[PDB]
Amino acid sequence: IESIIKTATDTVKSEINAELGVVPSLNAVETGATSNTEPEEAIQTRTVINQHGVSETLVENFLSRAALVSKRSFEYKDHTSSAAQTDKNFFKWTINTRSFVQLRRKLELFTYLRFDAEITILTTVAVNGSSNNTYVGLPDLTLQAMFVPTGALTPEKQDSFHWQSGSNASVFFKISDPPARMTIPFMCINSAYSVFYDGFAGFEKSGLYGINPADTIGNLCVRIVNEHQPVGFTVTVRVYMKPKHIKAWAPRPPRTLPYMSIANANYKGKGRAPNALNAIIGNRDSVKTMPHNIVTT
Amino acid sequence: GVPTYLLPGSGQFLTTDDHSSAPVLPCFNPTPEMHIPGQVRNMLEVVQVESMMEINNTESAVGMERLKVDISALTDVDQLLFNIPLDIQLDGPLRNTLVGNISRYYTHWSGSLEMTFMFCGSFMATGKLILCYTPPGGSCPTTRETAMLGTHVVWDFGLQSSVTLIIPWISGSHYRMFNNDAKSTNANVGYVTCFMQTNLIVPSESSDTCSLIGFIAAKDDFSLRLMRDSPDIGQLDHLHAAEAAYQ
Amino acid sequence: GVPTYLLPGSGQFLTTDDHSSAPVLPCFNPTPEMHIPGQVRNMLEVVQVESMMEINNTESAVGMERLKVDISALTDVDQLLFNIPLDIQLDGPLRNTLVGNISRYYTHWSGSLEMTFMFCGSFMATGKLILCYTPPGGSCPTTRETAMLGTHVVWDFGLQSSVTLIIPWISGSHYRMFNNDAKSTNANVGYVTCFMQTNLIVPSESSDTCSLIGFIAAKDDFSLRLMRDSPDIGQLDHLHAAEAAYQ
Amino acid sequence: GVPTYLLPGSGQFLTTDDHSSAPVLPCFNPTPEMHIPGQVRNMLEVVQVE
């Protein structure tokens, strides 16, 4: 039955028991219910009034911390001769929470999640260290970040007419500012995001398993707005996400083996315990061996 | 206009901050809520559910064999069967449990625990066991006459399949501390040990060897504080397909 | 939005500031308070407790010998026994006391002092002493007939072991000032001197020499202001093991 | 937080300004006032003397 709980529970004084037909220490695990034996039924107790708070384990507090989700480095220079795989003074990123493991493992404790996302963008720069270069000072560049929906058109070059942003949201910011920040709403076509998805995305059999495009937040497109200088620099962009206004359903077993890919749940494990496929806990010599046994002298 | 001045901490980015911030999509309407089963609001709701201990963490036990303890008939009285270390932050039988995994995101803990054991022998098998908890101060006990001076329960096999041992909160300080030292007076919990009270006795057509499954959970007096990055996960590289998000 | 402008002092860090600042750990619950003996709330509570004067600050006195003054029988009348400088900021007999140590964190002081003396001879020993305080203006007095014109008490040894001399607050200004000059009219307090009123008289089986212990404290009219770094402690280097905090 | 913007004259130091500013010595008690002869409050009191 639902109730409001702000502190851990009190303990009550208890006496000797010797009663026929009553056995509070015996239980029936096969039913699937957890044991209901209380401390006052197992031992003699004193009265204790308990003042410990429970707020640091609220779900909003557990999940609502800013975590790293993207890190990209690119060269700011004249790109006239660069190969086609290069980030030529701009890049595109498809927003996901799967690339850095500390955020991924925390979100994967739940089956469904509903939240708004607060996004923070941090930028840094350095002079390129070729043997022709001294240090020279660092420029205060302007950057543009444009938000683009999943599968929509994205810019092909640093000076494309696509950057005119007539209905797309854009943010412009300088390297000397505090980090840029904005909130993206809960955008799903369903009432919650699916953290796990046991199905296929399309009507034909050849589609991807475990991927559901309705859960993808969108694309972020980022460029330097300035023209290139006479000398090259390296620019690094970091993106942070903080969930807020959170609801969560159906808790799950935590991940134990290392992650392999952002695309799926595949596994391999360590070569030896802990976290090997055949052994999650580190070994001891026997079930009678106490591993940190105190020695008296 | 208003006269103002800037304080120390102006322009910093702190990852645990809490402020309003500019909406990207004005006039946007989010999808209506509907009822979904199994909503959770405090992580202490999850920590109260029983999960299996890996008591048989030995070199010869592979996969599911690590989740059970096998017991058999003995020729000698008062014998030790197994023991369990109680240090719920460290690597050991308690770590890969609902209470162990959630606790390793925090640094301080308090409150009582319960261990429950289920007997999985045949219907015709009989026996009695004694389960003991010893408060800290010296070495783990190795004889029944030493262990029975601690907190204990004597268990009879029968129509009820399972027994609970309460591990009561007994501490000088309000909290225990997940410092990286098993022998600290702020960290050590003591020991659990199991002995024969009589013997395992079975007829010729039953199997000569029977198994125990052990479970652990917290009581509702339990508390956690001072959140940290979990040591149960990490990476040295980018994952496979992580580059394809940029292409 | 709101029109604003920045004042002089924007962005400075002042070590005596008082502002709210961002919490590192949101939703954290600190440990409950419990009663502990001996809580203190103003440093003037500590300054009212008696502590021993180092009156025997001489080249021949080692360790605990510096905390007592020895007196013996004399062949001549009206003789001087000892004197004490009263400059409670400077190095001298008053410095290493509860009132001296706390006062040296401040720069201005005001209010009355008490000196108390305890006689530690045998039960069969007898004598009378005169204790004098002389207000400032010239040299310390060297004869009983000069000193007895000041504030004084005449003390008889007996069943009560100890006597108090009050040093009353007598000043032109509201406060005295811990300037680095002993002869300033804003700093000098005057002198304390002790003489024989009769003689120390003892029988043949008592020791021929007896000891005084001197104590000092402030009264509840006492006050301190203008806090500063204490001159009683300092360093020229990092301490031993200070590097190990970085390793 | 509050949306704001800076005006012309931000950060200037004007020698005839009048604002509150941070106290160096917190909880300090200044010496009590006492009566002193011959207080003056406007310079036009002095200008009236021969």
């Binding site: 039955i1 639902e2 039913t31 219910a33 909003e60 | 309003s20 405090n42 | 939703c27 | 509050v2």
Partner: peptide
């Protein structure tokens, strides 16, 4: 708590819901 934005999703985090029911996980039996 300060908020001058028009859209309600722009607001700060919400940390005041202390309602619980462990029995849906610990006692799911008839």
């Amino acid at each position: 708590q300060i908020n001058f934005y028009k859209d309600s999703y722009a607001a700060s985090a919400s940390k005041q819901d202390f309602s619980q029911d462990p029995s849906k996980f610990t006692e799911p039996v008839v």
